[PDB]
Design a binder for this molecule. Sequence first.
Ligand SMILES: [Mg+2]
Ligand SMILES: [Mg+2]
Ligand SMILES: [Mg+2]
Ligand SMILES: [Mg+2]
Ligand SMILES: [Mg+2]
Ligand SMILES: [Mg+2]
Ligand SMILES: [Mg+2]
Ligand SMILES: [Mg+2]
Ligand SMILES: [Mg+2]
Ligand SMILES: [Mg+2]
Ligand SMILES: [Mg+2]
Ligand SMILES: [Mg+2]
Ligand SMILES: [Mg+2]
Ligand SMILES: [Mg+2]
Ligand SMILES: [Mg+2]
Ligand SMILES: [Mg+2]
Ligand SMILES: [Mg+2]
Ligand SMILES: [Mg+2]
Ligand SMILES: [Mg+2]
Ligand SMILES: [Mg+2]
Ligand SMILES: [Mg+2]
Ligand SMILES: [Mg+2]
Ligand SMILES: [Mg+2]
Ligand SMILES: [Mg+2]
Ligand SMILES: [Mg+2]
Ligand SMILES: [Mg+2]
Ligand SMILES: [Mg+2]
Ligand SMILES: [Mg+2]
Ligand SMILES: [Mg+2]
Ligand SMILES: [Mg+2]
Ligand SMILES: [Mg+2]
Ligand SMILES: [Mg+2]
Ligand SMILES: [Mg+2]
Ligand SMILES: [Mg+2]
Ligand SMILES: [Mg+2]
Ligand SMILES: [Mg+2]
Ligand SMILES: [Mg+2]
Ligand SMILES: [Mg+2]
Ligand SMILES: [Mg+2]
Ligand SMILES: [Mg+2]
Ligand SMILES: [Mg+2]
Ligand SMILES: [Mg+2]
Ligand SMILES: [Zn+2]
Lengths: 232, 83
Amino acid sequence: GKVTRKIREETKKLRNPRKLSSPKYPNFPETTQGTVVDLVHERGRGVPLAHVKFNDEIYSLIATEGLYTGQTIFIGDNAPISIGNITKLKNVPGGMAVHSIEYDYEDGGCVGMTGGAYSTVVTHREETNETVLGLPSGQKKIFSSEVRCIVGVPSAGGIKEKPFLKASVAHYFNKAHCKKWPRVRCVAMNPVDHKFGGGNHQHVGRPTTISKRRPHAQLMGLIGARRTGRVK
Amino acid sequence: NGTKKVGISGRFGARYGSTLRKRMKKVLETQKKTYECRACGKTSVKRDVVGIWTCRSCKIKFAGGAYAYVTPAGTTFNNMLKQ
RNA sequence: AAGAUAAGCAAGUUUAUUGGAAGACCAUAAUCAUUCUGACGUGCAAAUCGAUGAUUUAAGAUGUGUAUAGUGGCGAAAG
RNA sequence: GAGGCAGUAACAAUAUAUGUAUAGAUAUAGACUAGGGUUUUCAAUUUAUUGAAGUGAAUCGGUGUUAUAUAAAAACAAAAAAGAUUAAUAAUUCUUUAUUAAAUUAUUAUAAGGUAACUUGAUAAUGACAGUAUAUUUCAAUAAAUUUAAGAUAAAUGAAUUAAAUUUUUAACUAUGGAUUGUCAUGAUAAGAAAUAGUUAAUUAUAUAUACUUGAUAAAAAUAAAAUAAUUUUAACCGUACCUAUACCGCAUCAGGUGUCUUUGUAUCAUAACAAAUAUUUUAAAUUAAAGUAAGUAAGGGAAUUCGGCAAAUUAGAUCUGUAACUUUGGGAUAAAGAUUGGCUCUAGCAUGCUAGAACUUUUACUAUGUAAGGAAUCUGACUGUUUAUUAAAAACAUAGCUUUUUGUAUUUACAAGAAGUGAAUUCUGCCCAGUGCAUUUGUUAAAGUUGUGUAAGCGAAUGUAAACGGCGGGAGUACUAUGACUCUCUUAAGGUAGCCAAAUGCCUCGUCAUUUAAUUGGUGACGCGCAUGAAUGGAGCAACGA
RNA sequence: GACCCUGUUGAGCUUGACUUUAGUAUGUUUUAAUAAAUAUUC
RNA sequence: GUGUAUAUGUUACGAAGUGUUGGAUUGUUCACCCGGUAAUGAGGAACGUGAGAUGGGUUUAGACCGUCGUGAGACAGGUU
Ligand SMILES: [Mg+2]
Ligand SMILES: [Mg+2]
Ligand SMILES: [Mg+2]
Ligand SMILES: [Mg+2]
Ligand SMILES: [Mg+2]
Ligand SMILES: [Mg+2]
Ligand SMILES: [Mg+2]
Ligand SMILES: [Mg+2]
Ligand SMILES: [Mg+2]
Ligand SMILES: [Mg+2]
Ligand SMILES: [Mg+2]
Ligand SMILES: [Mg+2]
Ligand SMILES: [Mg+2]
Ligand SMILES: [Mg+2]
Ligand SMILES: [Mg+2]
Ligand SMILES: [Mg+2]
Ligand SMILES: [Mg+2]
Ligand SMILES: [Mg+2]
Ligand SMILES: [Mg+2]
Ligand SMILES: [Mg+2]
Ligand SMILES: [Mg+2]
Ligand SMILES: [Mg+2]
Ligand SMILES: [Mg+2]
Ligand SMILES: [Mg+2]
Ligand SMILES: [Mg+2]
Ligand SMILES: [Mg+2]
Ligand SMILES: [Mg+2]
Ligand SMILES: [Mg+2]
Ligand SMILES: [Mg+2]
Ligand SMILES: [Mg+2]
Ligand SMILES: [Mg+2]
Ligand SMILES: [Mg+2]
Ligand SMILES: [Mg+2]
Ligand SMILES: [Mg+2]
Ligand SMILES: [Mg+2]
Ligand SMILES: [Mg+2]
Ligand SMILES: [Mg+2]
Ligand SMILES: [Mg+2]
Ligand SMILES: [Mg+2]
Ligand SMILES: [Mg+2]
Ligand SMILES: [Mg+2]
Ligand SMILES: [Mg+2]
Ligand SMILES: [Zn+2]
């Protein structure tokens, strides 16, 4: 046969990988004050970024919900908690919304980068100095304290309301996000290109649930499912 | 005035279905509307980019949602900080 | 189609204008290839010619520069 | 090396008694780049052969910067134009008037003025960035008037036709002021309107100001200073002829193919067509064959021809009346169906070149060129789109919409990133885990090591899972005849529910009934023990759309 | 001769055909020193 | 000849001179109806005749449904 589509797409990512910003905030020993300068828009991502200014140095950050040009925010380990400020994790009471959490201390940020997605805090445990967070995916993860984070819900709202009612709307989405579009179903192909292909009618003939035990080039279909079907 | 119940979604004509054009009328009403400026008090705030709202008079940009000036999940977290 | 203005009748509702949205409709130049199973068929031509047709601001057409090589590449998919 | 067929097929063939002319005929024409390389010009000898001559740059290209460890003769960048000369070069030679940069000379302000916006020698700025619609009429061009010149008519004409030149207030900001006011459209103002006084500019159509579409918001880097006058054997290296199709590529003087720009006159929407401009071109016969390739016309009948109305014919522009069933309420619709159209002389409106009405007249008026045949039903695909260069353009592919699954240590961070199936909207999505797969959890099984002994995953067993692969029976009696609501019985994982049909799915089969026709194996509507229909391997359904 | 047949002549493709292999999972041996705790054998 | 009164039939012998013609359905040959006439007779010639024509079916490479096969695939089953 020939090399299929999945392996040929990953080696096309090594010839020209996709490029993004990775915005991080600095670290400062005591509480300082900074000003918001302007709001911009990037090519790949939907959430707008913000340029703040600490000690006559301009950095880049993800914009929170209510933010206007010229406003003042504070950064430090013991800043007061309000909209757009960045404090330590232990100060916030249970029930609020944070949107950039570093895994360890003195890191930029790891969790909650996209627009419209936020996390919640559920508790504090004074023994061993740990707090449990509620991830946007729905899983409870235990975080160590003394990491610092930003208070508020991120901007850009709910983008998934109105559909791509035309085909032309989805053309410019996948082109900016560097994905392959359109896609051909694997049953329509000839049996050289794909395992499911060929035949006299369009059907599969093999079970579509494939274990994870098998090697890398044999993985296709619903890989390693614990369940299949509508629940009710 | 010419339309009975379609409204702004009459540009689509007689395609894409029925309930797909209902979902367009909810979103396109709140996108093209102008709002009050929180700074200057005038009604000149419009949208130009996804997530960026700016005023015509005072020229001050505000962060916000995709299609609305305020987000319903955005206003509930302002109340719990007031207490 | 939204938006806006007036004149009537009496919370609203008829009539007349202004405005110019849409993967809306139609032609020339340019492009493609449905039918005559027309012409030609040691041909003008190792795939052309005539009439008839389809097409229009876009998921279009095109020059140059850089990247992808044979159990390999590229593919809105006919091997 | 040379025959027959055979001088056969197939191609080329304008007029003049005197001419470097008078006529006819066909073809739009001209510049930069890619490719060609002396084909350029002249002389001599007959699209040939030989021999000479010809390409002149401080301001026209390259040489310079870069496209997120080798990239631009169309992106960025110091500076010029006329008028003439040669057999052939000319923003390059010559005349006239200019501009840039570098080296040497002569001279010198170190600040004034305005309440303010700002004016004058008195530095630290940028290269640099989508698309569409409307309003300006800058130039230019038309039209008119005038002044010189040209060509023709048997005649006639308030003086025709052609050429050259000369002419035809708005936006910001400042000071007073204290509440109104604009655009073709949307408006602007106590974060100060109108009205006054004033200071800057008016970007030359590839411009200016507004508005509109987007899960698309529309490149990089080298690059800076300034007053007045003068000077120069100061400004290096390479290409500058000619052809745009009979001087390229297809083995050719090939009806094919090949990037960009410019181009005059009539043309009441345009298109089509004709004429200008410019370039090429010389001599057989003819009222007569048959059968061909094109273009025309036809008495009476009107699809009887044929697998099939294949080919041809009819309709058509513009103004006024009028417009159905169905529907996803937007459409269907320019539905269908009728009536009018010339020429000349006037009247009436205001926006002054557009529109209504009236009288007179004729071998009657969009029709030279261009320009929809219409209606009623069925099957299938939602739509715009794409595809076997050279026998298949479709019911195939794609698409939005719906659903399942993997990942919390992503240069990117779960409204994100990989893997699969169906195919817009409306209404539905029934039963089965025995078989094969997939997931989760507590009998059999290798080697190496130790004086000797012991300990692996996997397979097997238990529990979940069918919008995972898939599957969804048969026989007997029982209420004038007839049928079986009801009952009995073999087994199995469960025994096809809601729906639909001789359908693109029914062998017997040209099934049975009705209707369409003079006559039907065709079409449509009903019937069902369905050889072998059936639910996201999706079932049912047609509004809009279809070479 | 593309249809059909023969040849101990070939090639593209599939799989519960025969024989094997890249990748991957799990054992054993190699692994810095030190102190302590716990369990199993004697 | 007659189970031939006339009319209308039926059987036998001689006889190839001349006639045997129009349409609806199907790819048809075959088949079956309508209309008419004196009478729509049976057949051969490489199952006459493609450098005479047409290309509807059959019969390469696109594609759909139903049945079989775990699968590539198959069907003198049905379509374009
Ligand atoms: Mg295929
Ligand atoms: Mg394979
Ligand atoms: Mg299917
Ligand atoms: Mg269109
Ligand atoms: Mg032909
Ligand atoms: Mg190579
Ligand atoms: Mg094939
Ligand atoms: Mg000839
Ligand atoms: Mg020569
Ligand atoms: Mg010359
Ligand atoms: Mg000159
Ligand atoms: Mg030259
Ligand atoms: Mg030249
Ligand atoms: Mg050319
Ligand atoms: Mg030629
Ligand atoms: Mg003749
Ligand atoms: Mg006739
Ligand atoms: Mg006639
Ligand atoms: Mg007929
Ligand atoms: Mg006939
Ligand atoms: Mg026709
Ligand atoms: Mg008249
Ligand atoms: Mg289609
Ligand atoms: Mg083809
Ligand atoms: Mg087509
Ligand atoms: Mg074709
Ligand atoms: Mg499809
Ligand atoms: Mg659906
Ligand atoms: Mg099972
Ligand atoms: Mg179940
Ligand atoms: Mg049933
Ligand atoms: Mg049906
Ligand atoms: Mg019948
Ligand atoms: Mg043998
Ligand atoms: Mg072999
Ligand atoms: Mg015979
Ligand atoms: Mg024969
Ligand atoms: Mg033939
Ligand atoms: Mg013959
Ligand atoms: Mg055929
Ligand atoms: Mg099967
Ligand atoms: Mg078949
Ligand atoms: Zn404002």
